[PDB]
Amino acid sequence: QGTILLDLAPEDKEYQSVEEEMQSTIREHRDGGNAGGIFNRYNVIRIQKVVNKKLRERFCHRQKEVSEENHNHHNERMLFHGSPFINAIIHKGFDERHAYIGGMFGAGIYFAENSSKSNQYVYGIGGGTGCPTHKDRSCYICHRQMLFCRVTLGKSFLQFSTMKMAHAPPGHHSVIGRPSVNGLAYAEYVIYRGEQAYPEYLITYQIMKPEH
């Protein structure tokens, strides 16, 4: 009972595959690097597979209900997630009860294909006040954490804005906020049921300073 974190050896193919997806999904943001920091590569310090029997079962049960409703298509995808609550998530699983309508966000759990997008949220909306110790959004000292999870999207509802939503629209199971020239630059993937995502990998890392 409870979660078991298993370290992967950097020689393991799985490890290598998770780190390349993360390093290669780094993009520039019209941020000036304000939110997530200035860098063009990560120092992956650790990758652990999150093993939890109960969470895997809740996940598989919900995936069945979604397939039934989506013509036997659960439409699963591997996506990143960044937030100050990773440690609670890896233990109790994703919980929609901690999501609220506010700002540009609705009351759901947001995910991203670009790890640099998830990095912007590791310390809070807009990066918050940065790391706890140095209150620096571009801190190269403190260790950050993000999750590469399995996400059951089922039938997604394509929109431009994700604020104002409490649940997926009728007949749907997830919402996708898409690129608008006066809105998002990258797609946002939202679920309103924590059981629709399984935190497969726990990534410990740091952003590295641009080399001179």
Ligand X SMILES: CC1(C)OC(=O)N(c2ccc(-c3cnc(N)c(-c4ncccn4)c3)cc2)[C@H]1c1ccccc1
141 binds, among ligand X, Zn ion, none (CB under 5 to 8 A by kind): Zn ion
136 contacts ligand X (rule: CB under 6 A): no
Cβ closer to ligand X: 22 or 151?
A: 151
Q: Is 125 in the site for ligand X (CB under 6 A)?
A: yes
| Residue 190 CB partners (closer than 8 Å, separation 6+) | 106, 108, 109, 110, 111, 162, 165, 174, 175, 176, 177
**166 is an interface residue for ligand X by CB under 6 A:** no
Return the HEC string of 29-82. CCCCCCCCCCCCCEEEEEEEEEECHHHHHHHHHHHHHHHHHCCCCCCEEEEEEC
Does 142 appear as a known binding residue? yes
Establish if 134 lies at the interface with Zn ion (CB under 5 A).
yes
Pattern 71-90, binding to ligand X, x per CB under 6 A?
------------xxx--xx-
> What are the φ/ψ torsions at residue 211 (nearest 5 degrees)?
-75, 155
R_g over Cα of the chain = 17
35-64: contacts with ligand X (CB under 6 A): none
Which pair of structure tokens corresponds to residue 20?
Answer: 């390349």
Among 39, 59, 80, 110, binds ligand X (CB under 6 A): 110
The one among 133, 170, 211, 212 contacting Zn ion by CB under 5 A? 133
Contact flag: residue 139 with Zn ion (CB under 5 A): yes
Sign of CA dihedral 87, 50, 187, 190: negative
**Interface residues with ligand X (CB under 6 A)?**
83-85, 88-89, 92, 94-95, 98-99, 105, 109-110, 121, 124-125, 194
